[PDB]
Amino acid sequence: AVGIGAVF
Amino acid sequence: DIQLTQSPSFLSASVGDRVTITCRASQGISNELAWYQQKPGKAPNLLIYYASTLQSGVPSRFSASGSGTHFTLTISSLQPEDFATYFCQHMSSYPLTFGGGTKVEIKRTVAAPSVFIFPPSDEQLKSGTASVVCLLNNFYPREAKVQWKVDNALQSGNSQESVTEQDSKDSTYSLSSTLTLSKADYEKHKVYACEVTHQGLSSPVTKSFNRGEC
Amino acid sequence: QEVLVQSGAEVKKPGASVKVSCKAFGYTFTGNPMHWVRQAPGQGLEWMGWINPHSGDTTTAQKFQGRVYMTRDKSINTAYLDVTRLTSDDTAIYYCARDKYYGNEAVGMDVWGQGTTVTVSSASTKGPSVFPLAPSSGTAALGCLVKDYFPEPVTVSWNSGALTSGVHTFPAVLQSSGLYSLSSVVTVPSSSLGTQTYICNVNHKPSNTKVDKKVEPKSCDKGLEVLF
What we know:
The complex is a heterotrimer.
Chain A: no helix or strand
Chain B: E1 4-7, E2 10-13, E3 19-25, E4 33-38, E5 45-49, E6 53-54, E7 62-65, E8 70-75, E9 85-90, E10 102-106, E11 114-118, H1 122-127, E12 129-139, E13 145-150, E14 153-154, E15 159-163, E16 173-182, H2 183-186, E17 191-197, E18 205-210
Parallel strand pairs in B: 2-10
Antiparallel strand pairs in B: 1-3, 3-8, 4-5, 4-9, 5-6, 7-8, 9-10, 11-12, 12-16, 13-14, 13-17, 15-16, 17-18
Chain C: E1 3-6, E2 10-12, E3 18-25, E4 34-39, E5 45-51, E6 58-60, E7 68-73, E8 78-83, E9 92-99, E10 109-112, E11 116-120, E12 129-133, E13 139-149, E14 155-158, E15 167-169, E16 173-174, E17 180-189, E18 198-204, E19 209-215
Parallel strand pairs in C: 2-11
Antiparallel strand pairs in C: 1-3, 3-8, 4-5, 4-9, 5-6, 7-8, 9-10, 9-11, 12-13, 13-17, 14-18, 15-17, 16-17, 18-19
């Protein structure tokens, strides 16, 4: 699935 | 872009029925699909993710299946709180898209509308316009044809319709059709008639008045 | 309690901009990407983009790139949607929604804001004119026509909220003039027409317009020559 990078 | 096609777009069902809704993706999307419920004036609520995993807090009468292109949401025994619109959504590539929705409404017996016509008020006429209102009250199903006839001539493009949601007690609809004209256009003609066609009417019902005859 | 609280309704002219806010409560704001999804009146859902609240990185739908900007302010747990160069086609309810984001991929939108209504129109604020729909020739129907107002919404009650049963207040319709109109109707006993007075209480808060309209019965007592 699509992603938007690492988060906290 | 990926298109999600939902079927059916509209469903009438009774409490206790099994409801089955399908979503077809134009391209393979694995299990990257979610289902939502939405009620009027409210945000959607997540029911299913990973195409078949029930979201926490969701009643277990909801379930779903599929992987690839063809997905199915099932409500095992429909309850009053489940009448709503349902949407699928993929997240396989950009842009994310939603299906067109499936509106689940309450099935009931046919009920013919009571038809009323209201001529323009004296207050509106002195202001320079004339609105003629045709009311269809407490009918089922929602499909209806309302035709305006002016001096027995069929109108087009000069009216707008508005419809309520199902009444909370009898599950019927009501509808208004409003013919709007300038005072000068209104005073070009005599007979103003609204003709209504509905499954509960063995023949169309016409309500009419003569301009100024009231 | 994990909730998203959005800013209030906005009315804008074509060419203007609107900035919608979405404030997160009850969880660590930077732990979940935030989507923006809109819904035009009577239509389905349209995804606009999403933002990573940790990095501030955005992925904006191609339809909106160049005029829509997603940003965030970590210090107040707030995501913002700036929609610029508005046209009437941007009239919609705008939602923010958090993604579960398991494995750092999109999974599903599990918490939603309450929505922010945005109306884009060249029309100017105007209170409605309230006209009676007079009852005439065992029940009778009457009502009030609430015509030519902007923006939405209006409220309609009957007899100061006393009369509630049999009432049908229709959804507003947008006219080609850019103004809205609707009617509210009610069915009452026809025997009570000469002894009970029915008033529709129309309130339009954007224009501070309050109208009480008394709906008097009028005489339309003519039939037609028929042949059955």
